[PDB]
Design an enzyme around this catalytic site. Sequence first.
Site, PDB file in Angstrom:
ATOM      1  N   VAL A 123       0.858  -1.181   0.000  1.00 28.24           N
ATOM      2  CA  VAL A 123       0.000   0.000   0.000  1.00 28.24           C
ATOM      3  C   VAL A 123       0.896   1.233   0.000  1.00 28.24           C
ATOM      4  O   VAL A 123       1.923   1.267   0.686  1.00 28.24           O
ATOM      5  CB  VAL A 123      -0.978  -0.001   1.201  1.00 28.24           C
ATOM      6  CG1 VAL A 123      -0.248   0.243   2.517  1.00 28.24           C
ATOM      7  CG2 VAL A 123      -2.090   1.022   0.992  1.00 28.24           C
TER       8      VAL A 123
ATOM      9  N   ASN B 172       8.004   2.712  -7.426  1.00 26.41           N
ATOM     10  CA  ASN B 172       8.693   1.584  -6.807  1.00 26.41           C
ATOM     11  C   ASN B 172       7.710   0.557  -6.261  1.00 26.41           C
ATOM     12  O   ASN B 172       8.020  -0.639  -6.228  1.00 26.41           O
ATOM     13  CB  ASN B 172       9.618   2.078  -5.695  1.00 26.41           C
ATOM     14  CG  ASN B 172      10.789   2.880  -6.225  1.00 26.41           C
ATOM     15  OD1 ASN B 172      11.318   2.593  -7.299  1.00 26.41           O
ATOM     16  ND2 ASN B 172      11.203   3.894  -5.472  1.00 26.41           N
TER      17      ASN B 172
ATOM     18  N   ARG C  74      -7.428   2.737  -3.594  1.00 29.86           N
ATOM     19  CA  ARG C  74      -8.290   2.942  -2.434  1.00 29.86           C
ATOM     20  C   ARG C  74      -8.939   4.314  -2.551  1.00 29.86           C
ATOM     21  O   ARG C  74      -8.298   5.341  -2.314  1.00 29.86           O
ATOM     22  CB  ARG C  74      -7.521   2.802  -1.124  1.00 29.86           C
ATOM     23  CG  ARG C  74      -8.443   2.648   0.077  1.00 29.86           C
ATOM     24  CD  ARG C  74      -7.711   2.228   1.340  1.00 29.86           C
ATOM     25  NE  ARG C  74      -6.907   3.309   1.905  1.00 29.86           N
ATOM     26  CZ  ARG C  74      -6.212   3.208   3.034  1.00 29.86           C
ATOM     27  NH1 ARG C  74      -6.232   2.076   3.725  1.00 29.86           N
ATOM     28  NH2 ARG C  74      -5.503   4.236   3.477  1.00 29.86           N
TER      29      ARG C  74
ATOM     30  N   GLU D  82     -13.035  -2.613   8.994  1.00 31.51           N
ATOM     31  CA  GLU D  82     -12.341  -1.731   9.923  1.00 31.51           C
ATOM     32  C   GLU D  82     -13.284  -0.808  10.693  1.00 31.51           C
ATOM     33  O   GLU D  82     -12.837   0.223  11.209  1.00 31.51           O
ATOM     34  CB  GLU D  82     -11.300  -0.895   9.175  1.00 31.51           C
ATOM     35  CG  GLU D  82     -11.860  -0.136   7.985  1.00 31.51           C
ATOM     36  CD  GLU D  82     -10.861   0.840   7.403  1.00 31.51           C
ATOM     37  OE1 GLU D  82     -11.253   1.651   6.537  1.00 31.51           O
ATOM     38  OE2 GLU D  82      -9.681   0.794   7.808  1.00 31.51           O
TER      39      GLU D  82
ATOM     40  N   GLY E  96      -8.633  -3.949   8.848  1.00 29.32           N
ATOM     41  CA  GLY E  96      -7.926  -2.736   9.205  1.00 29.32           C
ATOM     42  C   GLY E  96      -7.973  -2.523  10.703  1.00 29.32           C
ATOM     43  O   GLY E  96      -8.849  -1.816  11.208  1.00 29.32           O
TER      44      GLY E  96
ATOM     45  N   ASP F 259      -7.987   1.367  12.289  1.00 25.95           N
ATOM     46  CA  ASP F 259      -9.267   2.066  12.203  1.00 25.95           C
ATOM     47  C   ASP F 259     -10.333   1.357  13.030  1.00 25.95           C
ATOM     48  O   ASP F 259     -11.168   2.007  13.671  1.00 25.95           O
ATOM     49  CB  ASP F 259      -9.713   2.177  10.745  1.00 25.95           C
ATOM     50  CG  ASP F 259      -9.404   3.538  10.135  1.00 25.95           C
ATOM     51  OD1 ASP F 259      -8.980   3.575   8.960  1.00 25.95           O
ATOM     52  OD2 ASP F 259      -9.595   4.562  10.822  1.00 25.95           O
TER      53      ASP F 259
ATOM     54  N   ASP G  16      -0.474   7.182   9.834  1.00 28.72           N
ATOM     55  CA  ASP G  16      -1.491   7.629   8.894  1.00 28.72           C
ATOM     56  C   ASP G  16      -2.666   8.151   9.712  1.00 28.72           C
ATOM     57  O   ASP G  16      -2.594   8.250  10.940  1.00 28.72           O
ATOM     58  CB  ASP G  16      -1.890   6.503   7.929  1.00 28.72           C
ATOM     59  CG  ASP G  16      -2.832   5.498   8.560  1.00 28.72           C
ATOM     60  OD1 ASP G  16      -2.626   5.139   9.740  1.00 28.72           O
ATOM     61  OD2 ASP G  16      -3.779   5.058   7.875  1.00 28.72           O
TER      62      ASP G  16
HETATM   63  O1  LIG Z   1      -5.677  -0.529  10.039  1.00 29.07           O
HETATM   64  C1  LIG Z   1      -6.221   0.235   9.215  1.00 29.07           C
HETATM   65  O2  LIG Z   1      -7.259   0.898   9.342  1.00 29.07           O
HETATM   66  C2  LIG Z   1      -5.461   0.334   7.883  1.00 29.07           C
HETATM   67  O3  LIG Z   1      -6.215   0.529   6.782  1.00 29.07           O
HETATM   68  C3  LIG Z   1      -4.150   0.658   7.850  1.00 29.07           C
HETATM   69  C4  LIG Z   1      -3.729   1.810   7.083  1.00 29.07           C
HETATM   70  O4  LIG Z   1      -4.465   2.465   6.391  1.00 29.07           O
HETATM   71  C5  LIG Z   1      -2.305   2.255   7.161  1.00 29.07           C
HETATM   72  C6  LIG Z   1      -1.703   2.470   8.395  1.00 29.07           C
HETATM   73  C7  LIG Z   1      -0.387   2.889   8.487  1.00 29.07           C
HETATM   74  C8  LIG Z   1       0.348   3.096   7.319  1.00 29.07           C
HETATM   75  O5  LIG Z   1       1.641   3.506   7.382  1.00 29.07           O
HETATM   76  C9  LIG Z   1      -0.232   2.889   6.071  1.00 29.07           C
HETATM   77  C10 LIG Z   1      -1.548   2.470   6.015  1.00 29.07           C
HETATM   78 CL1  LIG Z   1      -2.244   2.222   4.464  1.00 29.07          CL
HETATM   79 MG   LIG Z   2      -7.917   1.897   7.462  1.00 32.64          MG
END
Ligand SMILES: O=C(O)/C(O)=C/C(=O)c1ccc(O)cc1Cl
Ligand SMILES: [Mg+2]
Length: 709
Positions: A115, A126, A329, A419, A444, A447, A618
């Site tokens: 991701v 990359n 996404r 999530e 996820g 979240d 994030d």
């Molecule tokens: O657990 C969630 O809700 C989920 O979707 C994870 C993330 O969105 C994420 C968290 C940290 C990062 O460094 C990159 C991302 Cl992509």
């Molecule tokens: Mg998420």
Amino acid sequence: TDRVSVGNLRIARVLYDFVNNEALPGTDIDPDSFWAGVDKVVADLTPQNQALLNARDELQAQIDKWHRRIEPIDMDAYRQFLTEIGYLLPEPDDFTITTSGVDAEITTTAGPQLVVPVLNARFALNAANARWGSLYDALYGTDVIPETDGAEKGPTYNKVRGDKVIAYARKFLDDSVPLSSGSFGDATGFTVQDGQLVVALPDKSTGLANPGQFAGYTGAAESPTSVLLINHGLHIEILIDPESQVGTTDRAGVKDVILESAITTIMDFEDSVAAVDAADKVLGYRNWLGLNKGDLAAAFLRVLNRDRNYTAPGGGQFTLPGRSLMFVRNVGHLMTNDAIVDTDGSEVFEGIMDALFTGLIAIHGLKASDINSRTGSIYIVKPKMHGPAEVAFTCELFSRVEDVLGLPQNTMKIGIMDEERRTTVNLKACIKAAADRVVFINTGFLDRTGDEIHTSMEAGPMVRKGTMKSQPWILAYEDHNVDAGLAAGFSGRAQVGKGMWTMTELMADMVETKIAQPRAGASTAWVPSPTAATLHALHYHQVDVAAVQQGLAGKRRATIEQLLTIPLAKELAWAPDEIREEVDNNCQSILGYVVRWVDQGVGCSKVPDIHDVALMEDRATLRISSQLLANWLRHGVITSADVRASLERMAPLVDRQNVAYRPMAPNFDDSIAFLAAQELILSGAQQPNGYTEPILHRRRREFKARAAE
Ligand SMILES: O=C(O)/C(O)=C/C(=O)c1ccc(O)cc1Cl
Ligand SMILES: [Mg+2]
Ligand SMILES: [Mg+2]
């Protein structure tokens, strides 16, 4: 107000120009009927999008008042109440997914999934090239090989550390594709004789314990440049070059061991990018369109990869894809965005925008470039959905965009993010809502945690952030997700996936921990770097996920009672120093991530925590930290003066850590970044479902205003 009138919409000029000049040419879609389609879909679907949002607060408002009444658990009263108000919906009768037209990397291949922020061009480049990565590079530049005496890294090549890299890889080969007799460490070379692999030992010349793992070779068969292997659906390639410096010393002249890493890569428009206007959405759209048109290039000049040619064991030529199968996404249902306004002044929903514009863009991947899905699908992850009705709305959206873009129905497939709490305890109904579209479900966990903290904000003081990982509700949530996924025929048809590793430089910990996900039945899992994907591919070579899954068929290992177990704390579990360290840690990571979100526009950052661990932040991790402190403040284990002291303590620390930067300290009341983090905490329990985009976008919309006057 440099805007373009199309019916009821006033499209910002730069977006309208980008769609007409860069996105539409090549798709054979009349721009007039496209924009008329935009106006029609927005007018027809905004009512329920808004209606489903009011239903969230309405449900949460009742769960707020219910918690304000004094036994501990009582899962009996809590359940029939949650069914009364429509939170807990019936469990539909069993069923199997009908989704078709999907690529092998989704239905059958089990491996890492990358991701990446779509706004960072070099990253997405990359990430797309990450399908093939070096294992030697991943082991050398990383602490997987520890820098004990001798194996210290430095400016020059360290043969000691390099020797440990080779020895590490030799046991990987022996553990994944073994010889009949002997070990790969003592191999003196490789040849292909009569259509099969022959490896020369000092004693003899063994073959493969299973010749069916000999995938191919390059160069001549009697002295190949490379030997292609396959194990558990993932490809392994040994590079043979005695001329190279590594191969010069290797006992078989091996230069490197190549691994199939990120089989799929998710291009992210959501929690890892900061896009608040039309100007910001266009750079992500442009990069997403360049990836589909194949001509995305970074200033040497870095480009995408052609596929990799090979020779079969018999002698014929075949080929294997060199790029990762790309998702994208979208953003959830929540936010609006002034990229388009109407005559009445209101901003259009950002989620409707993304499905139309990323969907129009994805069409370029379906045809020839100077190519993505070969079976004709568009793969879109939709995050932050609450329950089965929202999945059905998400489905009617894609059905309306296909009609407008002309594509046959069910072209735009969807990977469901698991999530939020209302989706978690209604998951079987959510998969069925996309029964003919769903491509994956994925836990996820970050979240999902912030939603668990917010849904029970009024219940009581919550456990420390580092304790959620062992709470009973989250362990059920993971098994309950694998279960109802398999019970719907996902095995062989779609991915069952798990979550994110955030410690960017603790890869030795990643190697000795993220093996649990393939052991839990997950066919994919999230990595943050092309390097981490390579190191994550090792777990799939040790775990037969298709075997783990069919062992889990028919099992149900999580009850409705277990999923609803609120992670409250028992009274006075914490000393004063334990309270203070949690507060400092949460205040630290919020300030570190927000200041780059607001001052510089970066939606994903490495912020060291209190224990000096580099953490990929994030908006999801930010949702956890803000909601936790806002929960501890609400029930009174800290004061309002404790937060400001902690915020003012941690601010100059972040400043020294941070380049074209800009300090928040000492006059905090002037910094927009400092005021933003304060708002996410003190007004945290009043953001809808704890979401941080309302504060973040607005404060980012405010910083941009100053940096122009
Ligand atoms: O657990 C969630 O809700 C989920 O979707 C994870 C993330 O969105 C994420 C968290 C940290 C990062 O460094 C990159 C991302 Cl992509
Ligand atoms: Mg998420
Ligand atoms: Mg095996």
